[PDB]
């Protein structure tokens, strides 16, 4: 009916909006990982500097700085991965979920056409019956008519087939909307503590460096 | 006095690995604004998600859309601040070392004038004995001003990264526990 045409237009347009958001993360994950390398490689340069130095107080803190960035590229590495396995794969699998209803809605009208494919051959048996009813032969009178009542129930059979598939996808859609409400609040929190742990560990890293900078005398 | 030869032999390696740390610093700040640009490239596609979304879920989502707009600015602070304290401090001692290395060449220009006039004048001696003192002081003064600046630039940012990280903590926690108890 119309509710089935409804829950197909927006979903196409929603899955489109859903697919357009997954593209950013795949580049964001690529960007942070690129920065993790651009951080450890940068740390690998602040160490050779602190090594190639005549002053002692600076050479001490310079190494103590190059070590800090090596702790950040790991925090960066964990960040991008926890952005991929926990957010990107959270997406790439939900559009996969939307692909199931795209097959169910396909399967729903694959059953409707099956019903019409039964009504397509039903009008033939009555049409063929109209010919064997006029000209003189009693054989095909008791042959095609037996096939009439057969497909007459087949178009009834496929009709009730189409009715029930139309219903199971309604229960299938509602099965999502409740599971989305109770889980997304948690699923969006499950991702934020990673940023929280990163920020806390980020802060917990710089406050440990500050005394190592005052120690320069 | 081998002080001038070894410092020159120190001026060649420290310049080469400072330049290395400089180009790697800008890359770290370049690769940072890239992610910072994506935080506003994310909310652009994130706001367009609640365009056709349930009523109760629309509010659950848009509150984090405002969050990402704030996080785009904070990440813009660190990417810019690191270019003022790392690369710029690293860039400053690429040009002054380039000028400090130019100071020894003139001392040789008074030293070969010392050797040219010795195989025969005191103006090639009074100038060198002044250059072996004026440049001797302008070079040691360049150290204490560099060690202090290296200690200062490392201090200003450690107090900044503390505020930045503690800010974002006071920004994410304003949203996590807002969802733990909706
Ligand atoms: Pt749409
Ligand atoms: Pt190395
Ligand atoms: Pt259709």
Residue numbers in the entry:
A (entry chain A): 306 to 522
B (entry chain C): 206 to 325, 343 to 404
Sentences from the paper on this structure:
The crystal structure of the SNX1BAR–SNX5BAR complex presented here, together with analytical modeling, revealed that SNX1 comprises a hydrophobic binding hot spot compatible with homodimerization and heterodimerization, whereas SNX5 uses distinct patches of polar residues to preclude homodimerization and enhance heterodimerization. The structure forms an antiparallel dimer of three-helix bundles with a curvature that would fit a circle with a diameter of ~32 nm. The interface buries a large area of 5,114 Å2, of which 78% corresponds to polar surface. SNX1BAR and SNX5BAR exhibit complementary polarity at their distal and proximal interfaces. Consistent with previous predictions, the central region of SNX5BAR has a negative patch, whereas the equivalent region in SNX1BAR is neutral.
A key component of the recycling machinery is the endosomal sorting complex for promoting exit 1 (ESCPE-1), which rescues transmembrane proteins from the endolysosomal pathway for transport to the trans-Golgi network and the plasma membrane. The SNX protein family is defined by the presence of a phox-homology (PX) domain that typically binds phosphatidylinositol phospholipids (PtdInsPs), but may also participate in protein–protein interactions. Twelve out of the 33 annotated mammalian SNXs contain an additional carboxy-terminal Bin/Amphiphysin/Rvs (BAR) domain, and are therefore denoted as the PX-BAR or SNX-BAR subfamily. Herein, we show that ESCPE-1 has a single-layer coat organization and suggest how synergistic interactions between ESCPE-1 protomers, phosphoinositides and cargo molecules result in a global arrangement of amphipathic helices to drive tubule formation.
